[PDB]
Design an enzyme around this catalytic site. Structure first.
Site, PDB file in Angstrom:
ATOM      1  CG  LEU C  40      -2.344  -0.515   0.965  1.00  0.00           C
ATOM      2  CD1 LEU C  40      -2.317  -2.007   0.748  1.00  0.00           C
ATOM      3  CD2 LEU C  40      -3.220  -0.176   2.144  1.00  0.00           C
ATOM      4  CG  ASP C  41       0.763   3.608  -3.256  1.00  0.00           C
ATOM      5  OD1 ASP C  41       1.475   2.582  -3.300  1.00  0.00           O
ATOM      6  OD2 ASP C  41       0.138   4.043  -4.247  1.00  0.00           O
ATOM      7  CB  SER C  42       2.792   7.280   1.824  1.00  0.00           C
ATOM      8  OG  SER C  42       2.779   8.035   0.625  1.00  0.00           O
ATOM      9  CG  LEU C  43      -1.210   9.862  -0.268  1.00  0.00           C
ATOM     10  CD1 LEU C  43      -1.485  10.516  -1.600  1.00  0.00           C
ATOM     11  CD2 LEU C  43      -1.493  10.818   0.865  1.00  0.00           C
ATOM     12  CG  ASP C  44      -3.401   3.542  -1.580  1.00  0.00           C
ATOM     13  OD1 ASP C  44      -4.526   3.848  -2.028  1.00  0.00           O
ATOM     14  OD2 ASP C  44      -2.381   3.485  -2.299  1.00  0.00           O
TER      15      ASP C  44
END
Ligand SMILES: CCCCCCCCCCCCCCCCCC(=O)OC[C@H](COP(=O)([O-])OCC[N+](C)(C)C)OC(=O)CCCCCCCCCCCCCCCCC
Ligand SMILES: CCCCCCCCCCCCCCCCCC(=O)OC[C@H](COP(=O)(O)OCCN)OC(=O)CCCCCCCCCCCCCCCCC
Ligand SMILES: CCCCCCCCCCCCCCCCCC(=O)OC[C@H](COP(=O)(O)OCCN)OC(=O)CCCCCCCCCCCCCCCCC
Ligand SMILES: CCCCCCCCCCCCCCCCCC(=O)OC[C@H](COP(=O)(O)OCCN)OC(=O)CCCCCCCCCCCCCCCCC
Ligand SMILES: *P(=O)(O)OCC(C)(C)[C@H](O)C(=O)NCCC(=O)NCCSC(=O)CCCCCCCCCCCCC
Ligand SMILES: CCCCCCCCCCCCO[C@@H]1O[C@H](CO)[C@@H](O[C@H]2O[C@H](CO)[C@@H](O)[C@H](O)[C@H]2O)[C@H](O)[C@H]1O
Ligand SMILES: CCCCCCCCCCCCO[C@@H]1O[C@H](CO)[C@@H](O[C@H]2O[C@H](CO)[C@@H](O)[C@H](O)[C@H]2O)[C@H](O)[C@H]1O
Ligand SMILES: CCCCCCCCCCCCO[C@@H]1O[C@H](CO)[C@@H](O[C@H]2O[C@H](CO)[C@@H](O)[C@H](O)[C@H]2O)[C@H](O)[C@H]1O
Ligand SMILES: CCCCCCCCCCCCO[C@@H]1O[C@H](CO)[C@@H](O[C@H]2O[C@H](CO)[C@@H](O)[C@H](O)[C@H]2O)[C@H](O)[C@H]1O
Ligand SMILES: CCCCCCCCCCCCO[C@@H]1O[C@H](CO)[C@@H](O[C@H]2O[C@H](CO)[C@@H](O)[C@H](O)[C@H]2O)[C@H](O)[C@H]1O
Lengths: 670, 72, 85, 494, 98, 68, 73, 64
Positions: C40-44
């Site tokens: 998962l990304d830093s915003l997800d």
């Protein structure tokens, strides 16, 4: 019997409060509930006794205050207006008691809660059964002490402690003006008994009636939450829901209206107060209809709905149709109590969440609650042939029925205020039951669908309806909300009805508008509120369900951003009260304490006399060097000054200047 | 599932009993006892108030007028 | 009485399962990591903790939300809260 | 001997017994404290006997003794309805004042008991004396015992507190002495019967007023002259605080019914607007600065200033209602201020050693009996109905409005401001959140001693609120004698 | 610094969207748009421009702030917050006499 | 003297010793401590006092005009 | 005197309470303190007293009926 | 003229719709289906209307 209606709620309160340990939660609930049930039955009989037979009942026990020209008794009068108030007061008190067994089951302190409930019922009985204004003031203050005790029931929460300060002190402002108004009555007539004040009212100085009427009206704002002194009523939603159903929306709020209805044989002789009553009423209806449409708390909306109906009754009082205001007062306490007990039921189901933005669906989960609150909302909007139809719609056509500028004005104002009532009634019923679910799945996850494997025994909690002690009040109040208006329309509306012909509600033949309201008012204005309710309800349903983008467009525009925040922040009246009245008083206290009491009063006083004299005394004491040569010079000096004074015949004042000069020279150091 | 009633009245733990500090004797027998004895005596105190005297004369003046009926 | 580990896990498992940004629904376990185990990304992950916040009707302060970078750390936090529904 | 002299000898006899018991036994301090308490109860039993025999409608002084021997200074005792309830209040308080402070003294206990037993005699005398120089003699004989009560058993700022009370009360009372000496010079005696017959010239009255009011303004006290009380009451021991507020603050209230209402009427009438202007100001300022006080015991002391102003405007109303309301508000203040001082100075200070409202919160959670009584005494301070405090304020406020309406209208704002500080103090100590975190260990709730003096004081406040005719029937005829005025068809009868 | 700050602003701007748009479907489209605006600036490095985009975001969060933001019921600012707060000291009082 | 700031503008989620009051055991107190705490008059931060008078005037102007 | 229970005396609140107690020792006569002192001690009482004198005996309400005037003077 | 942030309120309102693709699409799909379809939500918005309508027609036919 009559004095037993007064005594029973008091005894149950004392057992629950001072003897809760001995009776326990169950015993306190039983004695508290049973005593007010018995009182309710004895009061339904007293309605047949007094009203239907035109037999007022007088009972005096002993004197309270005895002086010259002042004789105020612990005495009680039962007339048509007294028994009329007792029915909503005691029916709603009985049902909220039964309701509170289910709602407050998990709370630790039930004996203290139920004790405060009975204490409130006793005080409300004292307010409507008194012979005189000063014993009615005991119930007025008593209901205030009981509302403080019930708003602040959870003392641990600071918000609750702020809101109870608001209720207590905003009602003390009204009490100051009633105290001035009762002083005026004693000063003019010598006694403040009802029979005295009303028998002599037609002859008193017309300007003296102005002073009393204005003071009675100002005191009436605080309790009836009129726009000038209304900030406390929405903050009283901090106390538990059953408190807000009885005290904050069905009984205490009506005392201000009762004060004007009781004082009808007096304030009828001052048409100047009647204009103020009327405009006061119309302002509060639009002031609070607008605010409630922009609130996100369910209790806050239903609290602002109550103040819109209280504004209706004060409008009717200034319209000089007291039977209409009394009819609305009794009819409103049935459906306003219903909506609050129904809202309390959905708060209970949804984990104590009070925000519309987290409620959705729920119509299938709480079928009885939705229908019952649909019962209440149709009479709140005065849908034809409901209980509220005969009370609210007669106030509107009576305003136009008084063919005056002020009457046509208030008709337009009140009709607009009715439009916004229909808007926030849809909001409540759509966002809590009819909209898509806006809250967590936990309220909507059933066991018919398997979300679990090893925990199927527990952990679903899907927003269920409550038990018998919760639903029973709701069903009863629903039947009232459908039929009570029709079954009592003659006792109150009538055409030449003689129910209040014991001078409990005096209308002066000059102010009668009943016959024109029956015949003069056109059918269009008579039917106009109905079309508005049916037209707006569908318009707001589409803008909430079918076309949901448009309101997003409004609040995301800078124009609508300011309009949404203006009404959400309650006309910024709270803002200007804390900043310019409440904080101003706390600065004034600090300035007196810091700069005067601990400042100049001690500097131009004991502390400045201390530090001044000690400096002076050290200087004079430094003249004494124990040198005989210098002491001898002093004796010669003091000798010459005596010789000059008693040989130059100098004015004695010249001496005093010398002493003051000399003393102040030793006041300066170095 | 209500809990048992609890607490220590006067701060006396469930073991021991209230220990008389010294004030209790005179304050319960003398101070309060004097007030009950004063209360029972006050019932038989004759009423020498100005109003009981002024009401009876006032009735005899208004009885001499149609305002108050006279038993004679 | 209060919240159980199996109850909180079933709800967060269904939360991350319905999120299209997890690499596969299969490799979501109690000890799953957001950054690399789930990818998962830093915003997800910020969106994920918001969904967890909505599920339990609680508030996650910025100090506490930065600590939540795995399933187990999330499971522990929900049970460390006596305010979750 | 008379029965009014028995009132004075009993507290003196108790002083003798405390002083001589060690000479018959090393004796315990508990034995000294039972002697002082039994002695105060006997004075209360005599005073209830006097009240049973008292004639409620008599214009002659009662329970007097035929002196028949005249000297330069001679004690003349008598009782009228105007003074009977002040005597009763002194005899109900002094027993509680001793019980309240039963454990808190610890050191110099004989000295403490002797001063209170001596104070009871001096404060009883000031109501019983039938001369105005004898009134002054006892109205000011209380200053040496009170200087030493505060200095020996007071708090930290005791030395300055005791200097303030003595010097202000000495200074203020020396302007009263000049006015009294002038009246004695013009009439030849200060015996009330002879002085009340005499009518002074307006100019003499207007200068006798300046000097009795200066004394009373310092001893009321009014707003810019109240610094001594803010120090005296707070730094005083609990027992001294109860006496100073309940009984000593009433000496000026009862002194207007003797020194001003009957002998300086024209001066009182033409100067009432000055009194009312001061009384109005001290209602507002005192109340604004009671809201921002951070010492609890000094918040109870400031409350007393606002109440004294209502009863001061009541004594200057020339009305029957405001005069009786002034006496009712002084009796009511005697019970309620005693309870609030017991709560602040005798329960919180006992358990915490602090008076700062910063440290107290949520005390209802662990002390539910204290919070119940504390609430009732806060409501009475706020003048809630069902308490005697409401009746006195209503009658005091009505006569103020009937005399000069505008000032009574400002004075009526006490209904909003007394309520403001009373509930705000209450919500910050009993309520206001959970039990404070500054409390390291749990505090016990009320003791059977603390409970029963609070219950006794609350019982007097409520019962007298319901049936104030217990006190009103005695004052009617005697109050009727201090009114100045005529009515055009009721006067000068033939 | 400059990272949890931009993630706090990302969560904040998504709460302000759901506060004004009460309907979750509609806010869902709004939520995808605010991400696009954070994901449009994932290659800003120099602190001179990094902190300007946070300073100007903080202005748009105040410019469009809700008069009554949603608070969970048991959270600070919530309806049941501090309702039956337990005594913080359940131990019997130490044995002292008053 | 510290800045005269109402403690309702402090973080409710900080590691406060007294969480209810949002305070720590040693931190300095402004001399106005009484009316700066959580149990004190509220501070409303929706708009500025000047802008509020404007919007109160616009409501009044609209209602007077309807009367007209 | 009697031992009290243990209180976590905050050094910050203790020095604040000490500050409030000794504060008078530092009052000065400035242009500001004089302005506040003159307003409170002179102006407001003189304004209240002036209205008290002007309206004294101006009105009476007892037994006044229609056709009579409230004004005595 | 445009702000440094890509935020435009006209474009913000344009996206106030139901998005075509959503990473959370399936997580939220339960709120618009089943009990929460359009029909089901308003199936019983007027509880007693159906029973009352047919009942009132029975009373209305009193001519025969
Ligand atoms: C008329 C004369 C003036 C009458 C009002 C005098 C006000 C004196 C205030 C004294 C201090 C009261 C306690 C302050 C502490 C506190 O928490 O305040 C809580 C409350 C105010 O609470 P609040 O509104 O600030 O709290 C908001 C926050 N929530 C919603 C979470 C509770 O204090 C008062 O209510 C003071 C009285 C205000 C009266 C407003 C109407 C005046 C009408 C004049 C005509
Ligand atoms: C919430 C209120 C709860 C009240 C609980 C206590 C109830 C007490 C009931 C007392 C009933 C007394 C009945 C007296 C009948 C009248 C006979 C009489 O004259 O008694 C004198 C005195 C004053 O009464 P009176 O002068 O008659 O006043 C006129 C109204 N009847 O009447 C008296 O004797 C009263 C003297 C004591 C009054 C009670 C004081 C303590 C309470
Ligand atoms: C903060 C500060 C306590 C509060 C004050 C006491 C109550 C009000 C006292 C003032 C009014 C009473 C005296 C008026 C004297 C007079 O001559 O006024 C007459 C006039 C009405 O005249 P008219 O219409 O002829 O009378 C009826 C004839 N059928 O009367 C009027 O028109 C009076 C003017 C209208 C008053 C409306 C209420 C004003 C309230 C002001 C704020 C009060 C607080
Ligand atoms: C005296 C004369 C001057 C005073 C009278 C006029 C005063 C100005 C009146 C301005 C009225 C502006 C209406 C704005 C509607 C709005 O912005 O939303 C109101 C209400 C808020 O509800 P919300 O928080 O958005 O929850 C989601 C449900 N839509 O949204 C809803 O509840 C939806 C239902 C209402 C939608 C139609 C509103 C029609 C207004 C006419
Ligand atoms: P991951 O670690 O890969 O990335 C996380 C972040 C983005 C923090 C990176 O570490 C990063 O690149 N940091 C640099 C941060 C930066 O300078 N720019 C990123 C965007 S910050 C920002 O605010 C972008 C603009 C958003 C505009 C819309 C938000 C406000 C809307 C108004 C309120 C809501 C409507 C009413
Ligand atoms: C309860 C506390 C307050 C009670 C005390 C306050 C009472 C206030 C009473 C105000 C009215 C007094 O009496 C009032 O005085 C005004 C002047 O001021 C006069 O008013 C008069 O004005 C014009 C002349 O200008 C006359 O032609 C007219 O007949 C009358 O209205 C009358 O004499 C009377 O109406
Ligand atoms: C109308 C104007 C005023 C009318 C008259 C009122 C005058 C009152 C003046 C009293 C002045 C204070 O009187 C003086 O106070 C100081 C305290 O600061 C006392 O000083 C004492 O207290 C200090 C406090 O730190 C201690 O160190 C020690 O116990 C002692 O020195 C003096 O013993 C006393 O004489
Ligand atoms: C409501 C007010 C009631 C007041 C009743 C009467 C109170 C007593 C009146 C006189 C009080 C003494 O007044 C005080 O005298 C001394 C004179 O040395 C001065 O005291 C001070 O003077 C200057 C300040 O100006 C200082 O530098 C000096 O250190 C100090 O001695 C004060 O300037 C004055 O305020
Ligand atoms: C006009 C002047 C002012 C008058 C004001 C009223 C003052 C009244 C003072 C009371 C009389 C003195 O009080 C007296 O105190 C001393 C304290 O040393 C006591 O004396 C004893 O006290 C304790 C008793 O255990 C011993 O430890 C101590 O060694 C011993 O001296 C006397 O037994 C007591 O009688
Ligand atoms: C602050 C200090 C204020 C001044 C001190 C008080 C002054 C009082 O002094 C006052 O002076 C006037 C002047 O004749 C006198 O007052 C009276 O004296 C005689 C009465 O015996 C009358 O004839 C005279 O008409 C009258 O004025 C009295 O002597 C006294 O009442």
């Amino acid at each position: 019997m009559y004095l037993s209606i007064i005594i029973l709620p008091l005894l149950g309160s004392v057992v629950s409060g001072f003897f809760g340990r001995k009776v326990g939660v169950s015993g306190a609930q039983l004695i508290t509930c049973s005593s007010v049930i018995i009182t309710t039955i004895l009061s339904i009989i007293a309605f047949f006794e007094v009203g239907f037979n035109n037999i007022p009942v007088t009972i005096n026990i002993f004197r309270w205050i005895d002086s010259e020209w002042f004789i105020i008794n612990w005495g009680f009068q039962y007339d048509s207006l007294t028994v009329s108030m007792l029915i909503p007061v005691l029916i709603i008190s009985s049902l909220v008691h039964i309701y509170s067994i289910s709602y407050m089951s998990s709370d630790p302190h039930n004996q203290r809660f139920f004790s405060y409930l009975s204490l409130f019922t006793f005080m409300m009985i004292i307010l409507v059964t008194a012979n005189n204004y000063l014993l009615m003031f005991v119930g007025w203050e008593g209901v205030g002490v009981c509302s403080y005790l019930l708003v602040s029931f959870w003392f641990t929460r600071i918000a609750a402690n702020q809101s109870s300060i608001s209720a207590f002190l905003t009602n003390r402002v009204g009490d100051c003006f009633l105290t001035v108004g009762m002083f005026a009555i004693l000063w003019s007539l010598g006694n403040l008994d009802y029979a005295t004040v009303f028998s002599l009212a037609p002859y008193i100085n017309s300007n003296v009636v102005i002073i009393i009427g204005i003071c009675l009206l100002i005191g009436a704002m605080a309790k009836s939450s009129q726009v000038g002194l209304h900030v406390w009523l929405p903050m009283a939603m901090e106390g538990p829901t059953p408190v807000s159903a009885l005290i904050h929306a069905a009984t205490m709020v009506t005392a201000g209206v009762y004060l004007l209805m009781r004082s009808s044989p007096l304030i009828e002789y001052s048409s100047t107060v009647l204009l103020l009553c009327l405009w006061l009423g119309a302002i509060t209806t639009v002031f609070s209809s607008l605010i409630g449409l922009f609130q996100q708390d369910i209790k806050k909306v239903i609290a602002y709905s109550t103040m819109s109906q209280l504004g209706m009754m004060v409008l009717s009082i200034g319209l000089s149709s007291y039977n209409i205001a009394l009819f609305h007062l009794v009819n409103h306490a049935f459906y306003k109590a219903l909506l609050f007990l129904g809202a309390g039921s959905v708060i209970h189901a949804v984990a104590d969440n009070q925000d519309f933005r987290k409620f959705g669906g729920l119509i299938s989960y709480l079928p009885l609650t939705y229908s019952v609150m649909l019962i209440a909302s149709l009479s709140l909007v005065a849908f034809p042939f409901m209980t509220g139809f005969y009370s609210k719609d007669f106030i509107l056509e009576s305003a136009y029925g008084q063919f005056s500028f002020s009457g046509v004005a208030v008709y337009i104002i009140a009709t607009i205020g009715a439009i916004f009532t229909t808007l926030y009634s849809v909001k409540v019923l759509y966002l809590t039951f009819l909209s898509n679910p806006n809250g967590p799945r936990t309220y909507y996850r059933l066991a018919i669908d398997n979300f679990f494997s090893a925990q199927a025994i527990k952990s679903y909690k899907p927003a269920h309806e409550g038990d018998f002690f919760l639903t029973l009040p709701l069903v009863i109040l629903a039947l009232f909300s459908i039929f009570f208006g029709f079954i009592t329309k003659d006792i109150f509306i009538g055409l030449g009805s003689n129910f209040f012909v014991d001078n409990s509600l005096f209308i002066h033949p000059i102010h009668e508008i009943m016959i024109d309201t029956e015949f003069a008012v056109p059918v269009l204005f008579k039917l106009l509120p109905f079309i508005f309710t049916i037209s707006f309800s569908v318009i707001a349903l589409t803008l909430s369900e079918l076309l949901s983008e448009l309101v997003i467009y409004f609040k995301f525009s800078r124009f609508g951003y300011n309009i949404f925040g203006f009404f959400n922040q309650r006309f910024l009246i709270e803002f200007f009260y804390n900043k310019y009245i409440t904080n101003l008083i706390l600065n004034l206290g600090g300035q007196i304490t810091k700069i005067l009491d601990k400042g100049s009063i001690e500097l131009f006083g004991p502390y400045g006399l201390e530090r001044g004299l000690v400096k002076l005394s050290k200087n004079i004491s430094s003249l004494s060097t124990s040198h005989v040569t210098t002491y001898a010079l002093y004796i010669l000096v003091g000798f010459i000054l005596y010789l000059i004074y008693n040989n130059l015949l100098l004015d004695y004042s010249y001496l005093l200047l010398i002493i003051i000069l000399l003393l102040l020279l030793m006041m300066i150091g170095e | 599932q209500y809990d048992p009633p609890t607490g220590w009245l006067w701060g006396v733990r469930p073991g021991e009993k209230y220990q008389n500090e010294g004030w209790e004797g005179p304050f319960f027998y003398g101070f309060w006892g004097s007030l009950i004895v004063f209360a029972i005596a006050y019932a038989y105190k004759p009423d020498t108030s100005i109003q009981t005297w002024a009401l009876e004369e006032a009735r005899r003046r208004l009885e001499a007028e149609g305002i108050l009926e006279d038993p004679n | 009485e209060g919240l159980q580990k199996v109850e909180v896990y079933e709800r967060i498992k269904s939360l991350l399962a319905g999120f299209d940004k997890v690499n596969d629904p299969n490799n979501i376990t109690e000890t799953a990591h957001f950054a690399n185990d789930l990818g998962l990304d830093s915003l997800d992950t910020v969106e994920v903790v918001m969904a967890i916040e909505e599920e339990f009707s609680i508030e996650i302060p910025d100090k506490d939300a930065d600590q939540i970078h795995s399933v187990d750390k999330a499971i522990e936090y929900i049970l460390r809260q006596p305010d979750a529904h | 001997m008379s029965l009014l002299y028995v009132l004075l000898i009993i507290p003196i006899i108790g002083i003798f017994l405390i002083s001589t018991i060690d000479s018959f036994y090393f004796f315990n301090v508990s034995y000294y404290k039972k002697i002082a308490l039994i002695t105060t109860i006997l004075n209360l039993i005599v005073s209830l006997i006097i009240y049973i025999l008292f004639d409620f409608s008599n214009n002659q002084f009662q329970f007097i003794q035929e002196n028949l021997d005249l000297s330069f200074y001679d004690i003349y005792l008598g009782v009228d309805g105007v003074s009977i309830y002040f005597v009763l209040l002194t005899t109900i308080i002094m027993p509680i004042a001793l019980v309240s402070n039963w454990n808190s003294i610890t050191n110099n206990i004989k000295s403490y008991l002797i001063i209170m037993l001596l104070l009871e005699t001096l404060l009883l005398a000031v109501f019983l004396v039938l001369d105005v120089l004898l009134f002054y003699i006892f109205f000011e004989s209380i200053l040496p015992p009170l200087f030493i009560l505060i200095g020996l058993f007071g708090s930290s700022n005791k030395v300055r507190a005791s200097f303030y009370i003595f010097l202000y009360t000495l200074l203020g009372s020396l302007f009263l002495l000049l006015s009294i000496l002038t009246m004695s010079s013009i009439v030849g005696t200060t015996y009330f019967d002879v002085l009340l017959k005499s009518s002074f010239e307006y100019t003499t009255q207007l200068f006798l007023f300046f000097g009795i009011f200066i004394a009373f303004a310092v001893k009321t006290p009014v707003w810019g002259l109240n610094s001594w009380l803010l120090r005296a009451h707070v730094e005083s021991p609990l027992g001294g605080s109860i006496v100073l507020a309940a009984i000593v603050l009433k000496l000026s209230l009862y002194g207007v019914f003797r020194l001003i209402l009957p002998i300086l009427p024209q001066a009182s009438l033409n100067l009432t607007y000055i009194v009312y202007a001061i009384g109005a100001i001290t209602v507002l300022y005192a109340s604004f600065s009671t809201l921002r006080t951070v010492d609890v015991k000094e918040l109870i002391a400031y409350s007393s200033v606002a109440h004294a102003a209502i009863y001061l405007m009541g004594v200057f109303s020339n009305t029957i209602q405001g005069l009786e309301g002034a006496i009712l508000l002084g009796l009511a203040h005697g019970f309620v201020s005693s309870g609030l001082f017991i709560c602040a100075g005798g329960i919180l200070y006992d358990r915490t050693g602090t008076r700062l409202i910063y440290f107290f919160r949520g005390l209802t959670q662990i002390m539910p009996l204290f919070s119940l009584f504390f609430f009732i005494l806060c409501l009475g301070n706020a003048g809630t109905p069902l308490t005697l405090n409401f009746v006195g304020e209503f009658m005091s406020l009505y006569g103020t409005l009937e005399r000069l309406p505008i000032a009574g209208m400002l004075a009526s704002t006490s209904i909003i401001f007394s309520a403001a500080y009373s509930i705000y103090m209450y919500n910050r100590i009993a309520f206001g959140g959970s039990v404070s975190l500054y409390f390291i260990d749990c505090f016990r709730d009320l003791t059977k001693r603390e409970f029963f003096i609070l219950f006794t004081l609350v019982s007097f406040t409520v019962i007298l609120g319901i049936y104030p005719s217990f006190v009103l029937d005695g004052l009617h005829y005697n109050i009727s004698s201090v009114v100045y005025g005529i009515e055009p068809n009721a006067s000068y009868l033939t | 610094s400059n990272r949890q700050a931009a993630l706090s602003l990302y969560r904040r701007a998504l709460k302000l969207a759901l506060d004004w748009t009460v309907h979750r479907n509609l806010w869902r489209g709004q939520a995808l748009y605010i991400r696009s605006l954070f994901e449009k600036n994932r290659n800003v490095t120099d602190p001179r421009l990094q902190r300007a985009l946070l300073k100007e975001t903080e202005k748009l969060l105040e410019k469009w702030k809700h008069p009554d933001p949603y608070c969970p019921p048991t959270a600070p600012g919530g309806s049941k917050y501090e309702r039956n707060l337990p005594v913080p000291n359940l131990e019997p009082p130490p044995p002292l006499k008053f | 003297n510290p800045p005269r700031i109402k403690r309702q503008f402090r973080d409710p989620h900080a590691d406060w010793w007294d969480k209810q009051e949002r305070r720590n055991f040693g931190e300095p107190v402004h001399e106005d401590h009484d009316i700066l705490g959580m149990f004190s008059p509220y501070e409303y931060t929706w708009i500025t006092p000047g802008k509020g008078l404007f919007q109160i005037g616009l409501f009044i102007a609209s209602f007077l005009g309807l009367c007209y | 005197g009697l031992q009290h229970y243990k209180i976590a005396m905050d050094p910050a609140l203790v020095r604040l309470g000490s500050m409030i107690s000794n504060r008078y020792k530092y009052f000065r006569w400035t242009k500001r303190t004089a302005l506040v002192s003159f307003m409170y001690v002179v102006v407001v009482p003189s304004t209240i007293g002036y209205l008290a004198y002007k309206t004294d005996g101006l009105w009476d309400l007892r037994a006044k009926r229609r056709g009579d005037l409230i004004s005595e003077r | 003229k445009p702000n440094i942030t890509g935020f435009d309120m006209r474009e913000f309102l344009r996206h106030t719709k139901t998005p075509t693709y959503d990473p959370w699409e399936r997580h939220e799909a339960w709120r618009y289906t089943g009990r929460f379809s359009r029909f089901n939500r308003f199936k019983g918005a007027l509880p007693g209307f159906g029973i009352a309508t047919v009942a009132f027609t029975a009373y209305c036919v009193f001519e025969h």
